[PDB]
Amino acid sequence: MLELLLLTSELYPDPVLPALSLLPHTVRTAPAEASSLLEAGNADAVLVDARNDLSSGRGLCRLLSSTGRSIPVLAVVSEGGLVAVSADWGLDEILLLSTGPAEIDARLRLVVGLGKVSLGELVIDEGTYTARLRGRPLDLTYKEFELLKYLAQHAGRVFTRAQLLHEVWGYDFFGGTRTVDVHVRRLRAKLGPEHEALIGTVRNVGYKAVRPA
DNA sequence: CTTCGTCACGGCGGCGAAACAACGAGGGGCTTCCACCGAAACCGCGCTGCGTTATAATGGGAGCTGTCACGGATGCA
C-alpha cells in the first residue's frame, strides 16, 4: 500500500533491502539522482542507498530535506556506518540493511502515518527573509536575517565567529572577515535603541545571544 | 541595465592579562638510640717444608754421524 522510490544504481531493490519483497509495498527504482525526485509521483516514502558511501547518501537526504512539503526521506546504511547517521541528515527515519519485514512495516506506518514560537520581540517570517522587532518594518540582508535567526533559536547559547560562520554563511569559509563585526554592528543598529541587549558580545568568547529579561 | 549585500580596511577603544615588588611557613640545623660494621681476637689445620728409611745392589745409552765454498786459524813435521 506504499510506493517506495529507491534512488540506487543496483538496478534491483533486492540487495538494497532484502526483506521488502516480503511486504506487498510497491517499489519503483531509479539511479541516485536528484532529477529522479521529479520521478516521484504518488510515492509515500523514499529510500536512499548509503551502505558503502555515507557522503552522497547523506547529501541526497539533505537534497530532499528542507524542500518541503515533504514526503519523508529514508536511507539504508551499514551498522558500522551508523556513526554518521544523525539528525543533521534531515532524516525522518533511518533503516539498516538487516531490519525485518514487520520492522520496516512499523517504521513506514509510523512515519507516513503549527505556528512559530511567540515571542522574543523578534518574529521570524520565512517568506521575504526578514523579521519584526517591536515594529512591522525590519530589513535584513541575505545574511543579516539568518544571523538573527541563528541567535534567535539558540538564545543564550555561546557561538564563536567560526561556529557562527559555517551555519550563518554557507560557509566557504573566508578569513580575516569581521563580517560578524560588520553584521552584529549592523544588526545592533537596525534593531533600534531597544533590543540592543539581545546579543551577548563579551571579548573573545564569540557572539552569544542574551534573551530577556 | 539597475540596484542591493558582502566583505575586507582601517581605526577606536576599553578590557585584560602578565610583569613586577611590600614579604612568612616548608627546608636547613638540632639531639637520641641501638641492629650493626668493623674491629679485635681466638682460635684450629691444609699446606709447605723437612727428616728418615738398613741385603746387596759399584761406571751414561745415544747418535748417526754428510752441502758449498772459502779464508783462515790451528796441530804436525
* Sign of the alpha-carbon dihedral angle for A102, A39, A126, A158: positive
Reduced to 3 states, what is the DSSP secondary structure of residue A167?
A: helix
**Chain B bases closer than 7 A to any CB of the protein:** 4-11, 14-16
Tracing cell 541528515 back to the chain, one arrives at A89
CA of A76 to C1' of B35 (A): 79
Is the distance between the Cβ of A174 and the closest atom of strand B smaller than 7 Å? yes
Residues 6+ apart with CB under 8 A from A136: none
Cα–Cα distance, A200 to A202 (Å, whole number): 6
- Cα of first residue to Cα of last residue in chain A, in angstroms, is 52
Is the distance between the Cβ of A185 and the closest atom of strand B smaller than 7 Å? no
Helices A161-168 and A146-153, axial angle in degrees (round to 10): 120
Is the distance between the Cβ of A201 and the closest atom of strand B smaller than 7 Å? no
Is the distance between the Cβ of A169 and the closest atom of strand B smaller than 7 Å? yes
Tell me whether strands A45-49 and A73-77 are parallel, antiparallel or unpaired.
parallel
Is the distance between the Cβ of A141 and the closest atom of strand B smaller than 7 Å? yes
Residues in chain A: 213
Q: Which among A6, A3, A196 has a CA at the least distance from the CA of A108?
A: A3
> Whose C1' is closest to the CA of A169: which nucleotide?
B6
Q: Which among A81, A66, A79, A71 has a CA at the least distance from the CA of A47?
A: A71
Cell of A82: 551508523
Tell me whether strands A3-7 and A130-132 are parallel, antiparallel or unpaired.
unpaired
